[PDB]
């Protein structure tokens, strides 16, 4: 479990946030096995990743990843979305496999408040629209 | 309150031991083969003051 | 604390008006109360079952319904700016007929 930094365990707030030692870190444990690959393999692109082993305290993942600028990948049209620079670091902004379930996006009645990304569907309904010819 | 003065000690801030006149580590040799199967003959050179 | 009981500060109004002790005189049970009649109120401390309140003493009202020993009457009472037609409920001993509507009747 993640615990927040908080020098010598002081919260400085109302007691609902006072507890320290058992926070949860809402992103997955796999998606933080992708950033620290991605921020040293900065020129590569990561397509997806998976699970391999679990000892006492490590949970190994084995990330597969793609060269965008390789000359066999800029041609050979099965994989010409990776060179298109909209997918520059498509793990750090969360759009990989766990970037599309821990971010929360699925169809349905029980994936509702995170159906098309939470922050868009927060600031679109507790805005208030005012027309010219107010209704 | 404050951190009382046996808590601000254990941080290495100013309470680091004064280490200018310590001549060296007062500790003896490790087990070579020549120590647990015979003898090797040492010779004292000088006696000093380790401050 | 303070006295705001149901029959507080009314020592002198429920005495049965000395040398007039004993039970009720039995002309009070051989007398009719039809609806529309006009009556007064005078409380007797003989029966502790159906007094009018401390306030409703010596005031005149019309009756509106009757039951086996009961007469409900209408009294106007004020609160600052208005009157309200109260609708009380009394045992029939505490009531005399108001002898004021003969000199208008006759």
């Amino acid at each position: 479990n993640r615990k927040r930094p908080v020098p010598k365990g002081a919260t400085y707030g109302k007691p609902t946030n006072q507890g320290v030692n058992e926070l949860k870190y809402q992103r997955s444990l796999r998606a933080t096995a992708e950033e620290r690959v991605g921020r040293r393999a900065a020129n590569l692109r990561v397509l997806n990743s998976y699970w391999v082993n679990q000892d006492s305290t490590y949970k190994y993942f084995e990330v597969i990843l793609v060269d965008p600028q390789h000359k066999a990948i800029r041609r050979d049209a099965r994989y010409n979305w990776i060179c298109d620079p909209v997918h520059k670091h498509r793990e750090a902004r969360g759009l990989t496999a766990t970037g599309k379930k821990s971010r929360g996006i699925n169809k349905g009645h029980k994936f509702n408040n995170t159906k098309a990304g939470r922050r868009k569907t927060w600031k679109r309904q507790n805005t208030l629209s005012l027309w010219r010819y107010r209704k | 309150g404050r951190v009382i003065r046996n808590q601000r000690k254990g941080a290495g801030s100013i309470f680091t031991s004064h280490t200018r006149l310590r001549q060296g580590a007062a500790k003896l040799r490790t087990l070579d083969y020549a120590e647990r199967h015979g003898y090797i003959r040492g010779i004292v050179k000088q006696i000093v003051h380790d401050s | 604390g303070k006295s705001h009981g149901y029959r507080s500060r009314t020592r002198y109004m429920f005495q049965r008006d000395f040398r007039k002790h004993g039970a009720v005189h039995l002309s009070t049970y051989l007398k009719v109360y039809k609806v529309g009649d006009i009556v007064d109120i005078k409380a007797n401390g003989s029966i502790q079952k159906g007094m009018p309140h401390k306030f409703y003493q010596g005031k005149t009202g019309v009756v509106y319904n009757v039951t086996k020993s009961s007469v409900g009457v209408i009294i106007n009472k004020m609160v600052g700016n208005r009157y309200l037609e109260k609708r009380l409920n009394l045992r029939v001993e505490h009531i005399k007929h108001s002898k004021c509507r003969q000199e208008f009747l006759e």
Partner: protein, 105 residues
């Protein structure tokens, strides 16, 4: 206060609707509670941090609690209630108090 048994009174019923026998008893709360809506809407708020959401009670002032005796019919075997007012000591048995013979200081 001394109360008897056998309490012959009006059953609620649909069978008799009439004065029948009622052998009285006296009840406590039974099982306290579990999984009953306002208990597990409450364990949702206790779980986690903060602690002691809904008000605990410290200022007690009473001494007697309102003995309530539940009836029990013997023909249709239903169960009605009634409440006596507050008393400190309450039995359910005998000593039909005879008049003032036995004083003996």
């Amino acid at each position: 206060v001394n109360v008897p048994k056998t309490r012959k009174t009006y059953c609620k019923g649909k069978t008799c609707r009439k004065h029948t026998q009622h052998k009285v008893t006296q009840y406590k709360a039974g099982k306290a509670s579990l999984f009953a809506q306002g208990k597990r809407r409450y364990d949702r708020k206790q779980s986690g941090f903060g602690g002691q959401t809904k008000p605990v009670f410290h200022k007690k002032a009473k001494t007697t609690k309102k003995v309530v005796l539940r009836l029990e019919c013997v023909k249709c075997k239903t169960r009605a209630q009634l409440t006596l007012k507050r008393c400190k000591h309450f039995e359910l048995g005998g000593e039909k108090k005879q008049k003032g013979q036995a004083l003996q200081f």
